[PDB]
Symmetry: C3
Subunit: 133 residues, 3 copies
């Protein structure tokens, strides 16, 4: 309970924009920091502390089952809650995002050794291609 | 010498926001770059140069001893000078940050494999949880 | 058919600024997202998906030959096109960037185990020091 010697990786975070706003800090810097995850390296020898804070952007996670409508909180983009439904269309993974936005969803399909992802939102359509590593 | 071939890690950086202000660049975009550290990989083949610039977030280091009041310059928050005093209250590491802000401090305690950090400034409290790795 | 379980690195993608503006988000956050590349780790077990998207900076690469004037599109700063010519002045690597800004260039020289970089634009000069690793 008193031994902080360790590399610590951040897993959550609460009222942080309010803490930065209370510290007299502006939009941008607040808008960056909300997208970062910190890592604390603490070297403690008795009463002596050495702390290092490393930042590396807020990883984003999504979990779903094909055919099971689930709640997708679309952070790192537009902090909205959307009901997502993933289905198989051949080998193309098609998704509908029921929420505040109309015509919100995406389509993803594998062609050979590459993954193609088409993002649809209203009138704007985003096509994305990924490379295997 | 003319041999710049090497991985170079940035150690300083002066008048850089002013350099961006002269380049016609605005607040926000400047507020990102001031929080970045670059690493240059220089590959020299005769008179041919190959440079790669990798950008990560700046790590911050703090060293203190509980019971010894020290001056903490909050470079990782809102560039302020505070006289900080860290004391043990049971097994909870409590800190008071005497400065321009009232009720400014933090508390840290280890509970199992997780680190809990509460940041207090006036009426705003920021909760952060870290996991051991 | 159907086993995309694998680490994917972003290589192309299409219209992203229009998609981000349509998602009700902009200003600071818009200026950052255009400079990031994501990598997706997909863990698929039958009909169960676990996806994690970790992001980093897109990084900038430059290739040139000393004495050969080339067209430099100055991204990661203020998106301008400058005619750049890099020449040796003793042991100082000097570059002139002919363009919209006057007296715009940089100089680079090795001093011991450190790399020194002075960035000049008009009246503002940015000093940067790198250490070899």
């Amino acid at each position: 309970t008193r031994d902080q010697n360790g590399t610590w990786e951040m897993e959550s975070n609460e009222n942080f924009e309010g803490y930065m706003k209370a510290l007299d800090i502006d939009f941008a810097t607040r808008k960056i920091a909300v997208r970062l995850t910190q890592t604390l390296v603490i070297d403690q020898d008795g009463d002596n502390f050495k702390k290092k804070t490393t930042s590396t952007f807020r990883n984003y996670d999504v979990d779903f089952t094909v055919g099971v409508e689930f709640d997708e909180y679309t952070k790192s983009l537009d902090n909205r809650h959307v009901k997502a439904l993933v289905t198989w269309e051949g080998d193309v993974l098609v998704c509908v995002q029921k929420g505040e936005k109309e015509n919100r969803g995406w389509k993803k399909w594998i062609e050979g050794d590459k993954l193609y992802l088409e993002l649809t939102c209203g009138d704007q359509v985003c096509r994305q291609v990924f490379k295997k590593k």
